């Protein structure tokens, strides 16, 4: 009879409880305090204009129906009590295919405080959309967003909030960086009110500022292009009495420039505008072609 008192507390807690009704349905506004702990900022896919993130997503609110009084001041309950009470229906406005992990059990956390305050934490991997403008590729800086809010609960029913100071709410771990190509500079939270065909909803926005690293594209494309341009300019020091020599020079440097341009344009998505690697490759191709036409003229 050591766990019978807690069983009685939990049974009395859910006796007369409707998990279809938010706390204060026609009396008050539900105040949800949100928190995000990023455990790893996943890889940013450039061809889908998306990114992946893995977060501990914490939400706190106050339900006056879940007041208890017992030998403990906080009940750290399972992840199956959360499905028997009202929890907010938070979704990610720009999510593509997110997963809420349930290995080995549903990675959810429920803590009820004796005055009725609940802390509800989830572990989930979000794959969100990051619309990018690739004018300055590969020397571009982005602000990948992560917008969430409540599905079906408007501003007069459920409002969101950060639980700590907004500059200290979205917290990224130190070892949590799965970025190969980018660099996470900082975070940036925001709050607003969007309006859709069902009403006005509160939306909590987070921006992660990424700055692409050029050290790969340099060695991949920029150094072969400059080497090819210099090797094309080598031909200007040869004697004109060797016509096949300079001919094979010109045609093979144009051939390597074509292969490099094709091999370089597969990196980024199938965008319809010109980037800065495309401008660099175009100017380098112009220089090579100028060398060949100069050879043709001489």
């Amino acid at each position: 009879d050591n766990t019978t008192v807690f069983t009685r507390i939990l049974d009395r807690l859910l006796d007369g409880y409707d998990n279809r009704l938010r706390p204060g349905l026609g009396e008050r506004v539900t105040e949800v305090k949100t928190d995000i702990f990023v455990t790893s900022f996943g890889p940013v896919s450039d061809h889908d204009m998306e990114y992946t993130i893995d977060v501990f997503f914490r939400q706190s609110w106050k339900d006056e129906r879940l007041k208890f009084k017992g030998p403990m001041t906080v009940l750290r309950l399972n992840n199956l009590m959360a499905s028997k009470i009202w929890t907010p229906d938070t979704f990610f406005h720009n999510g593509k295919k997110s997963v809420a992990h349930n290995m080995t059990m549903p990675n959810k956390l429920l803590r009820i405080t004796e005055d009725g305050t609940l802390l509800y934490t989830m572990r989930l991997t979000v794959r969100a959309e990051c619309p990018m403008h690739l004018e300055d590729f590969p020397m571009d800086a982005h602000a990948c967003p992560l917008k969430f809010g409540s599905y079906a609960y408007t501003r007069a029913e459920v409002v969101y909030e950060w639980t700590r100071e907004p500059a200290r709410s979205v917290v990224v771990a130190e070892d949590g960086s799965r970025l190969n190509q980018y660099d996470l500079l900082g975070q940036t939270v925001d709050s607003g009110i969007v309006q859709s065909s069902t009403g006005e909803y509160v939306v909590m926005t987070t921006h992660f500022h990424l700055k692409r690293k050029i050290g790969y594209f340099v060695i991949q494309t920029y150094l072969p292009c400059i080497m090819t341009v210099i090797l094309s300019q080598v031909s200007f020091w040869l004697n004109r009495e060797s016509v096949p020599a300079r001919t094979v020079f010109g045609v093979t440097t144009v051939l390597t420039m074509t292969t490099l341009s094709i091999s370089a344009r597969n990196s980024l998505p199938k965008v319809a505008y010109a980037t800065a690697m495309d401008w660099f490759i175009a100017v380098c191709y112009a220089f090579v072609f100028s060398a060949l036409i100069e050879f043709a003229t001489v």
Partner: antibody
Amino acid sequence: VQLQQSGAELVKPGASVKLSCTASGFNIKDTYMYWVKQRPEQGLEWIGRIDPANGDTKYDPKFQGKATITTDTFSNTAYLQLSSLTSEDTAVYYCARKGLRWAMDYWGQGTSVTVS
Amino acid sequence: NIVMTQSPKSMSMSVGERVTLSCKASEYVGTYVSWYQQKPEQSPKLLIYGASNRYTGVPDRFTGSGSATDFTLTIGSVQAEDLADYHCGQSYSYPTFGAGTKLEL
């Protein structure tokens, strides 16, 4: 809905003071409590921050080590303790309540602390 | 420490016209800037929260306009009781206020 602070008083240079702020109309375990200091005909200055539910506090770097904020949930009060006073501490101290998108919507009546 | 620069320090104007106050931040404060009104020998009262969100109990003549760095408060058709000090304060980080703005007739 209402925040009631203590009364104005004088204090000798070098002593310690304990200002109080009694909340009525809500539970302090729900929101944060801010302490703000205002000089005569100057701008407001933020002293510190307390989270009454957990108990952890933050302070302005200028006021770090000078002020100590504590709470008492039984009497529904919040306290601000000032130590090692100087002559530039003659001000009006306000007790504010966080709410509605981090705005400090509800303020106290303000206590006048004078250093003679 | 995010600093808020308010402008102007003082402004004298009559009753009925439109007036505008500006506030600028050093760092980023994304629509977390509140505007308070403090009358002489009184406590500050919240006028605008968020960046553009009228507090429940304020007239419609106050309007806020927000950004990431530049914020403004516009009062159209002022009255004789809208004279007070006005402070802008950010809340994106630990709160810091502006210098203030006196309003005289």
